[PDB]
Amino acid sequence: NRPINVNHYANKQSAAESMLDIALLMANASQLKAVVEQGNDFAFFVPLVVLISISLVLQIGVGVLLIFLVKYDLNNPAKHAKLDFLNNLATGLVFIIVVVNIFITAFGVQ
Amino acid sequence: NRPINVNHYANKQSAAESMLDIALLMANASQLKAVVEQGNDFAFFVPLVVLISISLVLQIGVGVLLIFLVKYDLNNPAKHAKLDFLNNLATGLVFIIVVVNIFITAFGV
Amino acid sequence: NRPINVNHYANKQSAAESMLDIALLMANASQLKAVVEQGNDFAFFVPLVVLISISLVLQIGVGVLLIFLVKYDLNNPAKHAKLDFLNNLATGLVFIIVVVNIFITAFGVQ
Amino acid sequence: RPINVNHYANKQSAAESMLDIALLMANASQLKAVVEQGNDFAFFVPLVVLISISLVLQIGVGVLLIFLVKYDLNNPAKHAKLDFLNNLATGLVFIIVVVNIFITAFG
Amino acid sequence: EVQLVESGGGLVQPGGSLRLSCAASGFNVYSSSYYYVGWVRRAPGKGEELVARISPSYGYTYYADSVKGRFTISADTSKNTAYLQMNSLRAEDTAVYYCEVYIFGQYFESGQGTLVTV
Amino acid sequence: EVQLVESGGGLVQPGGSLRLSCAASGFNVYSSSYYYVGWVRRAPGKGEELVARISPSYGYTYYADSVKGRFTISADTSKNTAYLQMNSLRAEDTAVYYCEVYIFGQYFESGQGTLVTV
């Protein structure tokens, strides 16, 4: 049967990943605001603010990587080394993001 | 020396989508707890609970789609018919999840 | 160097439309919440809530259209009829969204 | 029967400019509201800085979209410029989204 | 099927002039399509260089800085044929010139170019 | 059975030129297929080196820095054939060259390859 253009599939996935990254960045920005408004009186202010700030920096970085992953063409064999490195890095940063959000939850739900 | 295996590429992407989905699932469930602890004392309790619940149900559905997008091999030329359909559907549901998280963020402040 | 790939170009522009539409959805949803929280006592409550609701419905609709635009390959003459129809519709709805946001601004400035 | 792809990309850039204009209107209305609160608001300084950056980025993207309409996507000599300008607009539009996310969170 | 049929090679002296031409067949073309024809030259000890490119439906043209204002690309859409007029040739212009076509975002190039210059 | 038919090896003087060709058959191919053809070389006392790779529909190409600008790979899509043009062949280019085909995660390699002696 006639195949998918796998670059278009991979771009559409990278786009959905950028959309979920935006929705998470917007949740963690709301969390940051809700923590900073309580300030130094909160029991976990320092670690929670640090965790949320790390998570936002990582999310903005992953969004930039996803811009570059949509820029390059997965059909272009000269770009394979970049698209592969950038996608490995984006997946590793999304892993660190999910771990940090696990800790943001473990504090916030108290 | 060999090119990108686009099945491993699509799997890594679908896994990253699943991990961002899980992180948002936790963020939304933490908001849901914080809202349910305030309850009917808050003027937007009902709509904010509805929005968060819709987000959770949608993004659990997306996570199940991403599990199938990991199961089907993007190298197999016949499974493309299912893979394209489900990736379109996942993109649509992710967009609706964004829209609902926009409303959650607007109503939570 | 090689020519622009017009499917990549149209994808990137439809993505930038989706992003600006999302940023406007944030701005309109924030304005909607700020109006509904002031309630019926505001002098323009009814028309302003109506205008912002129309803007949101139209704008979610445009976002769905932009997600359908990216579905079709602008390299393929078999799909140019649908691509051009959907992009006409998206641009028309975006024009109506601008006119509504002009009236939203005109009432919000009061 | 194929489309004139320049009319297509021009009309896309028109819609993108129109959404950027509506967003610039909403951001200017919000900055007007913020400046009427003044220093009695807690997040006044960072919210004012966020909206200022958002407006500057939006004016930037609008000028890019002016050039993305003026240059013709069929003209092969402009492909280098239209490619650069379109990637740059994708960047600035991402920064605009991120800034408006924070403007929302501090709203 | 797509074929490029290329002609006009030569071996002229500096200051001479030549005319490459490149017919294409196997695809429909219209008063509006994202169609390009162009000429790329390759030479021992130098990189690939795009000499000229045109969109036949529109007549917009691109040229290299070493080529702009002395060569001239043109197209006859009635016979789907591109031409490169080369004038005031130089020893540095001694290269193998290949016809290129882009359509539908996919690429075709001439099977064997021609050497043009002595 | 998927088969790669390889030709064009030979003996040449340094600085000379050669053109390898690789016709692939036994599998369906489409545009937008995730398909590559390439060339890999092996020599005594050295590692296996990827020389060139092309996406034969889209025309994107990759080269090793050892041959980049000297070599050129091209595709002949309706004949499902690829060509590798070698120019300015160095003594260090003396190797056995194998055609590579890659289809959707399946790797195919030449039944014998062909020898280039500089």
PDB file of N, CA, C and O in Angstrom, chain A residues 5-8 11 70-80 83, chain B residues 3, chain C residues 1-9 12 75, chain D residues 83, chain E residues 42 48 100-109, chain F residues 31-38 50 52-63 72-75 77 82-83 100:
ATOM      1  N   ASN A   5       4.217   9.648   4.270  1.00  0.00           N
ATOM      2  CA  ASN A   5       5.416  10.483   4.334  1.00  0.00           C
ATOM      3  C   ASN A   5       5.833  10.594   5.795  1.00  0.00           C
ATOM      4  O   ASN A   5       5.238  11.343   6.572  1.00  0.00           O
ATOM      5  N   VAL A   6       6.865   9.838   6.177  1.00  0.00           N
ATOM      6  CA  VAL A   6       7.248   9.723   7.580  1.00  0.00           C
ATOM      7  C   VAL A   6       7.784  11.024   8.159  1.00  0.00           C
ATOM      8  O   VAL A   6       7.720  11.221   9.376  1.00  0.00           O
ATOM      9  N   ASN A   7       8.296  11.931   7.330  1.00  0.00           N
ATOM     10  CA  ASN A   7       8.637  13.258   7.836  1.00  0.00           C
ATOM     11  C   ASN A   7       7.401  14.025   8.281  1.00  0.00           C
ATOM     12  O   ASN A   7       7.436  14.719   9.300  1.00  0.00           O
ATOM     13  N   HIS A   8       6.309  13.940   7.529  1.00  0.00           N
ATOM     14  CA  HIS A   8       5.097  14.645   7.930  1.00  0.00           C
ATOM     15  C   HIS A   8       4.508  14.056   9.206  1.00  0.00           C
ATOM     16  O   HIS A   8       4.072  14.792  10.096  1.00  0.00           O
ATOM     17  N   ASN A  11       6.766  15.284  12.018  1.00  0.00           N
ATOM     18  CA  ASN A  11       6.462  16.677  12.332  1.00  0.00           C
ATOM     19  C   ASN A  11       5.156  16.816  13.098  1.00  0.00           C
ATOM     20  O   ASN A  11       5.060  17.617  14.027  1.00  0.00           O
ATOM     21  N   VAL A  70      11.193  20.190  13.981  1.00  0.00           N
ATOM     22  CA  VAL A  70      10.276  20.445  12.874  1.00  0.00           C
ATOM     23  C   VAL A  70      10.976  21.145  11.711  1.00  0.00           C
ATOM     24  O   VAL A  70      10.585  20.969  10.553  1.00  0.00           O
ATOM     25  N   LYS A  71      12.011  21.935  11.988  1.00  0.00           N
ATOM     26  CA  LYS A  71      12.740  22.620  10.925  1.00  0.00           C
ATOM     27  C   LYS A  71      13.430  21.636   9.986  1.00  0.00           C
ATOM     28  O   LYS A  71      13.277  21.723   8.763  1.00  0.00           O
ATOM     29  N   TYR A  72      14.189  20.692  10.531  1.00  0.00           N
ATOM     30  CA  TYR A  72      14.910  19.744   9.693  1.00  0.00           C
ATOM     31  C   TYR A  72      13.981  18.655   9.170  1.00  0.00           C
ATOM     32  O   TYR A  72      12.954  18.339   9.775  1.00  0.00           O
ATOM     33  N   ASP A  73      14.356  18.083   8.027  1.00  0.00           N
ATOM     34  CA  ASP A  73      13.548  17.090   7.330  1.00  0.00           C
ATOM     35  C   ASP A  73      14.090  15.694   7.615  1.00  0.00           C
ATOM     36  O   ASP A  73      15.263  15.412   7.357  1.00  0.00           O
ATOM     37  N   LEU A  74      13.228  14.830   8.152  1.00  0.00           N
ATOM     38  CA  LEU A  74      13.603  13.461   8.486  1.00  0.00           C
ATOM     39  C   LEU A  74      13.922  12.608   7.265  1.00  0.00           C
ATOM     40  O   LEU A  74      14.499  11.528   7.421  1.00  0.00           O
ATOM     41  N   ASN A  75      13.557  13.050   6.062  1.00  0.00           N
ATOM     42  CA  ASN A  75      14.023  12.390   4.848  1.00  0.00           C
ATOM     43  C   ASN A  75      15.457  12.738   4.466  1.00  0.00           C
ATOM     44  O   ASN A  75      16.055  12.014   3.667  1.00  0.00           O
ATOM     45  N   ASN A  76      16.021  13.813   5.002  1.00  0.00           N
ATOM     46  CA  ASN A  76      17.328  14.280   4.553  1.00  0.00           C
ATOM     47  C   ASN A  76      18.433  13.498   5.256  1.00  0.00           C
ATOM     48  O   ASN A  76      18.635  13.670   6.462  1.00  0.00           O
ATOM     49  N   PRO A  77      19.173  12.639   4.547  1.00  0.00           N
ATOM     50  CA  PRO A  77      20.150  11.787   5.235  1.00  0.00           C
ATOM     51  C   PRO A  77      21.330  12.536   5.820  1.00  0.00           C
ATOM     52  O   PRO A  77      21.996  11.994   6.710  1.00  0.00           O
ATOM     53  N   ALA A  78      21.619  13.754   5.362  1.00  0.00           N
ATOM     54  CA  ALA A  78      22.671  14.541   5.994  1.00  0.00           C
ATOM     55  C   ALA A  78      22.237  15.066   7.354  1.00  0.00           C
ATOM     56  O   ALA A  78      23.082  15.343   8.211  1.00  0.00           O
ATOM     57  N   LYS A  79      20.936  15.219   7.562  1.00  0.00           N
ATOM     58  CA  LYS A  79      20.378  15.701   8.816  1.00  0.00           C
ATOM     59  C   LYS A  79      20.092  14.603   9.830  1.00  0.00           C
ATOM     60  O   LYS A  79      19.804  14.927  10.980  1.00  0.00           O
ATOM     61  N   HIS A  80      20.176  13.326   9.451  1.00  0.00           N
ATOM     62  CA  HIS A  80      19.911  12.254  10.408  1.00  0.00           C
ATOM     63  C   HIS A  80      20.698  12.391  11.707  1.00  0.00           C
ATOM     64  O   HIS A  80      20.139  12.204  12.790  1.00  0.00           O
ATOM     65  N   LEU A  83      18.903  15.232  13.644  1.00  0.00           N
ATOM     66  CA  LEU A  83      17.556  14.897  14.081  1.00  0.00           C
ATOM     67  C   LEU A  83      17.586  13.812  15.148  1.00  0.00           C
ATOM     68  O   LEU A  83      16.834  13.876  16.126  1.00  0.00           O
TER      69      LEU A  83
ATOM     70  N   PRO B   3      20.971   4.841   8.677  1.00  0.00           N
ATOM     71  CA  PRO B   3      20.093   5.995   8.879  1.00  0.00           C
ATOM     72  C   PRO B   3      19.210   5.828  10.106  1.00  0.00           C
ATOM     73  O   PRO B   3      19.176   4.786  10.760  1.00  0.00           O
TER      74      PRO B   3
ATOM     75  N   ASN C   1      21.864  25.089  -3.217  1.00  0.00           N
ATOM     76  CA  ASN C   1      20.628  25.282  -2.469  1.00  0.00           C
ATOM     77  C   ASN C   1      19.437  24.811  -3.286  1.00  0.00           C
ATOM     78  O   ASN C   1      19.505  24.753  -4.511  1.00  0.00           O
ATOM     79  N   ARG C   2      18.342  24.482  -2.603  1.00  0.00           N
ATOM     80  CA  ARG C   2      17.161  23.923  -3.237  1.00  0.00           C
ATOM     81  C   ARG C   2      15.932  24.768  -2.913  1.00  0.00           C
ATOM     82  O   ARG C   2      15.878  25.414  -1.862  1.00  0.00           O
ATOM     83  N   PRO C   3      14.935  24.791  -3.798  1.00  0.00           N
ATOM     84  CA  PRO C   3      13.755  25.631  -3.566  1.00  0.00           C
ATOM     85  C   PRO C   3      13.067  25.342  -2.240  1.00  0.00           C
ATOM     86  O   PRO C   3      13.244  24.291  -1.623  1.00  0.00           O
ATOM     87  N   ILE C   4      12.268  26.319  -1.805  1.00  0.00           N
ATOM     88  CA  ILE C   4      11.348  26.112  -0.695  1.00  0.00           C
ATOM     89  C   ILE C   4      10.504  24.880  -0.963  1.00  0.00           C
ATOM     90  O   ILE C   4       9.961  24.711  -2.059  1.00  0.00           O
ATOM     91  N   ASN C   5      10.394  24.008   0.036  1.00  0.00           N
ATOM     92  CA  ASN C   5       9.360  22.979   0.038  1.00  0.00           C
ATOM     93  C   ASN C   5       8.070  23.613   0.546  1.00  0.00           C
ATOM     94  O   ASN C   5       7.950  23.917   1.737  1.00  0.00           O
ATOM     95  N   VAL C   6       7.103  23.816  -0.350  1.00  0.00           N
ATOM     96  CA  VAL C   6       5.918  24.586   0.007  1.00  0.00           C
ATOM     97  C   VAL C   6       5.021  23.869   1.001  1.00  0.00           C
ATOM     98  O   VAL C   6       4.254  24.528   1.709  1.00  0.00           O
ATOM     99  N   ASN C   7       5.086  22.542   1.093  1.00  0.00           N
ATOM    100  CA  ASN C   7       4.365  21.879   2.172  1.00  0.00           C
ATOM    101  C   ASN C   7       4.988  22.178   3.529  1.00  0.00           C
ATOM    102  O   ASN C   7       4.268  22.410   4.503  1.00  0.00           O
ATOM    103  N   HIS C   8       6.316  22.250   3.603  1.00  0.00           N
ATOM    104  CA  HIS C   8       6.954  22.701   4.836  1.00  0.00           C
ATOM    105  C   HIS C   8       6.623  24.157   5.134  1.00  0.00           C
ATOM    106  O   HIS C   8       6.391  24.520   6.289  1.00  0.00           O
ATOM    107  N   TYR C   9       6.613  25.005   4.109  1.00  0.00           N
ATOM    108  CA  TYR C   9       6.313  26.420   4.304  1.00  0.00           C
ATOM    109  C   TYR C   9       4.894  26.629   4.823  1.00  0.00           C
ATOM    110  O   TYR C   9       4.675  27.341   5.813  1.00  0.00           O
ATOM    111  N   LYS C  12       4.659  25.294   8.427  1.00  0.00           N
ATOM    112  CA  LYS C  12       5.247  26.228   9.382  1.00  0.00           C
ATOM    113  C   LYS C  12       4.363  27.451   9.606  1.00  0.00           C
ATOM    114  O   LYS C  12       4.197  27.907  10.744  1.00  0.00           O
ATOM    115  N   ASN C  75       1.999  19.850  -1.674  1.00  0.00           N
ATOM    116  CA  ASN C  75       2.657  19.389  -2.888  1.00  0.00           C
ATOM    117  C   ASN C  75       1.739  18.633  -3.840  1.00  0.00           C
ATOM    118  O   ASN C  75       2.144  18.388  -4.980  1.00  0.00           O
TER     119      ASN C  75
ATOM    120  N   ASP D  83      12.636  31.760   3.503  1.00  0.00           N
ATOM    121  CA  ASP D  83      12.977  30.691   4.440  1.00  0.00           C
ATOM    122  C   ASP D  83      13.504  31.235   5.762  1.00  0.00           C
ATOM    123  O   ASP D  83      13.037  30.841   6.841  1.00  0.00           O
TER     124      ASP D  83
ATOM    125  N   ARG E  42      29.263  21.564 -11.831  1.00  0.00           N
ATOM    126  CA  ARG E  42      30.177  20.824 -10.972  1.00  0.00           C
ATOM    127  C   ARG E  42      31.514  20.708 -11.688  1.00  0.00           C
ATOM    128  O   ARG E  42      31.552  20.486 -12.901  1.00  0.00           O
ATOM    129  N   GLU E  48      29.895  21.978  -5.872  1.00  0.00           N
ATOM    130  CA  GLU E  48      28.700  22.181  -6.676  1.00  0.00           C
ATOM    131  C   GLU E  48      28.214  23.616  -6.531  1.00  0.00           C
ATOM    132  O   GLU E  48      28.186  24.170  -5.429  1.00  0.00           O
ATOM    133  N   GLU E 100      18.457  20.754 -13.823  1.00  0.00           N
ATOM    134  CA  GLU E 100      17.680  20.346 -12.663  1.00  0.00           C
ATOM    135  C   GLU E 100      16.209  20.660 -12.898  1.00  0.00           C
ATOM    136  O   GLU E 100      15.870  21.614 -13.602  1.00  0.00           O
ATOM    137  N   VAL E 101      15.336  19.846 -12.314  1.00  0.00           N
ATOM    138  CA  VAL E 101      13.922  20.173 -12.188  1.00  0.00           C
ATOM    139  C   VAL E 101      13.484  19.896 -10.759  1.00  0.00           C
ATOM    140  O   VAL E 101      13.849  18.868 -10.179  1.00  0.00           O
ATOM    141  N   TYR E 102      12.696  20.807 -10.192  1.00  0.00           N
ATOM    142  CA  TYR E 102      11.918  20.534  -8.991  1.00  0.00           C
ATOM    143  C   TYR E 102      10.435  20.669  -9.296  1.00  0.00           C
ATOM    144  O   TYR E 102      10.003  21.666  -9.883  1.00  0.00           O
ATOM    145  N   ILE E 103       9.665  19.660  -8.897  1.00  0.00           N
ATOM    146  CA  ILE E 103       8.211  19.701  -8.955  1.00  0.00           C
ATOM    147  C   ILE E 103       7.694  18.898  -7.773  1.00  0.00           C
ATOM    148  O   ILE E 103       8.344  17.956  -7.315  1.00  0.00           O
ATOM    149  N   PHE E 104       6.522  19.279  -7.271  1.00  0.00           N
ATOM    150  CA  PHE E 104       5.854  18.506  -6.226  1.00  0.00           C
ATOM    151  C   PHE E 104       6.786  18.239  -5.047  1.00  0.00           C
ATOM    152  O   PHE E 104       6.655  17.230  -4.351  1.00  0.00           O
ATOM    153  N   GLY E 105       7.736  19.141  -4.812  1.00  0.00           N
ATOM    154  CA  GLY E 105       8.713  18.945  -3.761  1.00  0.00           C
ATOM    155  C   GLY E 105       9.679  17.801  -3.967  1.00  0.00           C
ATOM    156  O   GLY E 105      10.376  17.425  -3.020  1.00  0.00           O
ATOM    157  N   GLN E 106       9.749  17.237  -5.168  1.00  0.00           N
ATOM    158  CA  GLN E 106      10.634  16.123  -5.468  1.00  0.00           C
ATOM    159  C   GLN E 106      11.523  16.493  -6.650  1.00  0.00           C
ATOM    160  O   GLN E 106      11.172  17.339  -7.474  1.00  0.00           O
ATOM    161  N   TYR E 107      12.679  15.839  -6.730  1.00  0.00           N
ATOM    162  CA  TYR E 107      13.817  16.348  -7.481  1.00  0.00           C
ATOM    163  C   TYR E 107      14.194  15.400  -8.611  1.00  0.00           C
ATOM    164  O   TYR E 107      14.164  14.177  -8.449  1.00  0.00           O
ATOM    165  N   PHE E 108      14.551  15.986  -9.752  1.00  0.00           N
ATOM    166  CA  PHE E 108      15.108  15.286 -10.902  1.00  0.00           C
ATOM    167  C   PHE E 108      16.323  16.058 -11.395  1.00  0.00           C
ATOM    168  O   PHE E 108      16.335  17.290 -11.337  1.00  0.00           O
ATOM    169  N   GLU E 109      17.347  15.352 -11.873  1.00  0.00           N
ATOM    170  CA  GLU E 109      18.471  16.029 -12.506  1.00  0.00           C
ATOM    171  C   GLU E 109      18.945  15.267 -13.735  1.00  0.00           C
ATOM    172  O   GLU E 109      18.714  14.065 -13.886  1.00  0.00           O
TER     173      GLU E 109
ATOM    174  N   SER F  31       7.174   7.380  -4.170  1.00  0.00           N
ATOM    175  CA  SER F  31       7.509   8.657  -3.563  1.00  0.00           C
ATOM    176  C   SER F  31       6.983   8.707  -2.135  1.00  0.00           C
ATOM    177  O   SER F  31       6.000   8.048  -1.786  1.00  0.00           O
ATOM    178  N   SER F  32       7.662   9.490  -1.298  1.00  0.00           N
ATOM    179  CA  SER F  32       7.403   9.515   0.137  1.00  0.00           C
ATOM    180  C   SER F  32       7.692   8.186   0.832  1.00  0.00           C
ATOM    181  O   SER F  32       7.487   8.070   2.044  1.00  0.00           O
ATOM    182  N   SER F  33       8.164   7.182   0.099  1.00  0.00           N
ATOM    183  CA  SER F  33       8.740   6.012   0.749  1.00  0.00           C
ATOM    184  C   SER F  33      10.005   6.402   1.500  1.00  0.00           C
ATOM    185  O   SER F  33      10.772   7.257   1.054  1.00  0.00           O
ATOM    186  N   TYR F  34      10.224   5.771   2.654  1.00  0.00           N
ATOM    187  CA  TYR F  34      11.438   5.999   3.436  1.00  0.00           C
ATOM    188  C   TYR F  34      12.532   5.088   2.890  1.00  0.00           C
ATOM    189  O   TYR F  34      12.838   4.026   3.433  1.00  0.00           O
ATOM    190  N   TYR F  35      13.139   5.532   1.793  1.00  0.00           N
ATOM    191  CA  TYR F  35      14.015   4.709   0.976  1.00  0.00           C
ATOM    192  C   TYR F  35      15.343   5.430   0.831  1.00  0.00           C
ATOM    193  O   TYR F  35      15.372   6.635   0.575  1.00  0.00           O
ATOM    194  N   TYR F  36      16.442   4.696   0.998  1.00  0.00           N
ATOM    195  CA  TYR F  36      17.762   5.202   0.659  1.00  0.00           C
ATOM    196  C   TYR F  36      18.513   4.211  -0.216  1.00  0.00           C
ATOM    197  O   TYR F  36      18.324   2.997  -0.116  1.00  0.00           O
ATOM    198  N   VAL F  37      19.368   4.752  -1.073  1.00  0.00           N
ATOM    199  CA  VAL F  37      20.440   4.015  -1.722  1.00  0.00           C
ATOM    200  C   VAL F  37      21.746   4.693  -1.344  1.00  0.00           C
ATOM    201  O   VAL F  37      21.799   5.913  -1.159  1.00  0.00           O
ATOM    202  N   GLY F  38      22.805   3.901  -1.224  1.00  0.00           N
ATOM    203  CA  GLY F  38      24.081   4.466  -0.837  1.00  0.00           C
ATOM    204  C   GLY F  38      25.215   3.573  -1.277  1.00  0.00           C
ATOM    205  O   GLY F  38      25.010   2.515  -1.875  1.00  0.00           O
ATOM    206  N   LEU F  50      31.034   4.663   5.119  1.00  0.00           N
ATOM    207  CA  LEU F  50      29.926   5.099   4.276  1.00  0.00           C
ATOM    208  C   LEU F  50      30.366   6.242   3.372  1.00  0.00           C
ATOM    209  O   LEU F  50      30.742   7.315   3.853  1.00  0.00           O
ATOM    210  N   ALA F  52      28.564   7.517   0.295  1.00  0.00           N
ATOM    211  CA  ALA F  52      27.497   8.410  -0.126  1.00  0.00           C
ATOM    212  C   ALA F  52      26.151   7.747   0.123  1.00  0.00           C
ATOM    213  O   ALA F  52      26.033   6.521   0.094  1.00  0.00           O
ATOM    214  N   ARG F  53      25.137   8.575   0.364  1.00  0.00           N
ATOM    215  CA  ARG F  53      23.762   8.116   0.492  1.00  0.00           C
ATOM    216  C   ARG F  53      22.834   9.167  -0.097  1.00  0.00           C
ATOM    217  O   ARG F  53      23.093  10.366   0.023  1.00  0.00           O
ATOM    218  N   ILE F  54      21.755   8.713  -0.733  1.00  0.00           N
ATOM    219  CA  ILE F  54      20.768   9.592  -1.349  1.00  0.00           C
ATOM    220  C   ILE F  54      19.372   9.133  -0.956  1.00  0.00           C
ATOM    221  O   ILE F  54      19.106   7.930  -0.869  1.00  0.00           O
ATOM    222  N   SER F  55      18.480  10.093  -0.719  1.00  0.00           N
ATOM    223  CA  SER F  55      17.051   9.817  -0.785  1.00  0.00           C
ATOM    224  C   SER F  55      16.567   9.983  -2.221  1.00  0.00           C
ATOM    225  O   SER F  55      16.365  11.113  -2.680  1.00  0.00           O
ATOM    226  N   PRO F  56      16.364   8.889  -2.959  1.00  0.00           N
ATOM    227  CA  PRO F  56      16.276   9.006  -4.422  1.00  0.00           C
ATOM    228  C   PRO F  56      15.037   9.726  -4.919  1.00  0.00           C
ATOM    229  O   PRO F  56      15.043  10.203  -6.059  1.00  0.00           O
ATOM    230  N   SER F  57      13.978   9.818  -4.117  1.00  0.00           N
ATOM    231  CA  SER F  57      12.817  10.614  -4.505  1.00  0.00           C
ATOM    232  C   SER F  57      13.007  12.096  -4.201  1.00  0.00           C
ATOM    233  O   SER F  57      12.815  12.945  -5.077  1.00  0.00           O
ATOM    234  N   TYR F  58      13.375  12.426  -2.965  1.00  0.00           N
ATOM    235  CA  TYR F  58      13.527  13.819  -2.568  1.00  0.00           C
ATOM    236  C   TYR F  58      14.846  14.431  -3.017  1.00  0.00           C
ATOM    237  O   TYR F  58      14.959  15.659  -3.057  1.00  0.00           O
ATOM    238  N   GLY F  59      15.840  13.615  -3.353  1.00  0.00           N
ATOM    239  CA  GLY F  59      17.110  14.124  -3.827  1.00  0.00           C
ATOM    240  C   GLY F  59      18.046  14.644  -2.761  1.00  0.00           C
ATOM    241  O   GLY F  59      19.081  15.225  -3.103  1.00  0.00           O
ATOM    242  N   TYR F  60      17.723  14.464  -1.484  1.00  0.00           N
ATOM    243  CA  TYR F  60      18.664  14.796  -0.423  1.00  0.00           C
ATOM    244  C   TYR F  60      19.821  13.805  -0.435  1.00  0.00           C
ATOM    245  O   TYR F  60      19.627  12.608  -0.654  1.00  0.00           O
ATOM    246  N   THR F  61      21.031  14.306  -0.198  1.00  0.00           N
ATOM    247  CA  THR F  61      22.234  13.492  -0.289  1.00  0.00           C
ATOM    248  C   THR F  61      23.132  13.732   0.915  1.00  0.00           C
ATOM    249  O   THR F  61      23.148  14.820   1.495  1.00  0.00           O
ATOM    250  N   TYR F  62      23.879  12.691   1.282  1.00  0.00           N
ATOM    251  CA  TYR F  62      24.912  12.761   2.304  1.00  0.00           C
ATOM    252  C   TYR F  62      26.224  12.237   1.741  1.00  0.00           C
ATOM    253  O   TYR F  62      26.232  11.292   0.949  1.00  0.00           O
ATOM    254  N   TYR F  63      27.330  12.855   2.154  1.00  0.00           N
ATOM    255  CA  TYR F  63      28.665  12.428   1.764  1.00  0.00           C
ATOM    256  C   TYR F  63      29.574  12.420   2.983  1.00  0.00           C
ATOM    257  O   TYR F  63      29.433  13.250   3.885  1.00  0.00           O
ATOM    258  N   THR F  72      29.732  12.444  -6.170  1.00  0.00           N
ATOM    259  CA  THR F  72      28.356  12.889  -6.358  1.00  0.00           C
ATOM    260  C   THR F  72      27.474  11.682  -6.636  1.00  0.00           C
ATOM    261  O   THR F  72      27.732  10.928  -7.576  1.00  0.00           O
ATOM    262  N   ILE F  73      26.440  11.511  -5.820  1.00  0.00           N
ATOM    263  CA  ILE F  73      25.459  10.442  -5.963  1.00  0.00           C
ATOM    264  C   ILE F  73      24.203  11.007  -6.609  1.00  0.00           C
ATOM    265  O   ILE F  73      23.823  12.154  -6.349  1.00  0.00           O
ATOM    266  N   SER F  74      23.555  10.205  -7.452  1.00  0.00           N
ATOM    267  CA  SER F  74      22.328  10.633  -8.111  1.00  0.00           C
ATOM    268  C   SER F  74      21.408   9.435  -8.282  1.00  0.00           C
ATOM    269  O   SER F  74      21.833   8.282  -8.184  1.00  0.00           O
ATOM    270  N   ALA F  75      20.135   9.725  -8.549  1.00  0.00           N
ATOM    271  CA  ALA F  75      19.092   8.714  -8.633  1.00  0.00           C
ATOM    272  C   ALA F  75      18.349   8.799  -9.959  1.00  0.00           C
ATOM    273  O   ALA F  75      18.307   9.848 -10.604  1.00  0.00           O
ATOM    274  N   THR F  77      14.802   7.550 -10.811  1.00  0.00           N
ATOM    275  CA  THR F  77      13.739   6.979  -9.991  1.00  0.00           C
ATOM    276  C   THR F  77      12.871   5.992 -10.763  1.00  0.00           C
ATOM    277  O   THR F  77      12.482   4.950 -10.223  1.00  0.00           O
ATOM    278  N   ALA F  82      20.577   4.028  -8.931  1.00  0.00           N
ATOM    279  CA  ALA F  82      21.407   5.121  -8.458  1.00  0.00           C
ATOM    280  C   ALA F  82      22.776   5.069  -9.115  1.00  0.00           C
ATOM    281  O   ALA F  82      23.254   4.004  -9.515  1.00  0.00           O
ATOM    282  N   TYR F  83      23.399   6.237  -9.219  1.00  0.00           N
ATOM    283  CA  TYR F  83      24.740   6.387  -9.760  1.00  0.00           C
ATOM    284  C   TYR F  83      25.596   7.121  -8.743  1.00  0.00           C
ATOM    285  O   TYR F  83      25.129   8.055  -8.087  1.00  0.00           O
ATOM    286  N   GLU F 100      24.583   0.035  -1.123  1.00  0.00           N
ATOM    287  CA  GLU F 100      23.642  -0.126  -0.026  1.00  0.00           C
ATOM    288  C   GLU F 100      22.250   0.242  -0.518  1.00  0.00           C
ATOM    289  O   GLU F 100      22.086   1.219  -1.253  1.00  0.00           O
TER     290      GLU F 100
END
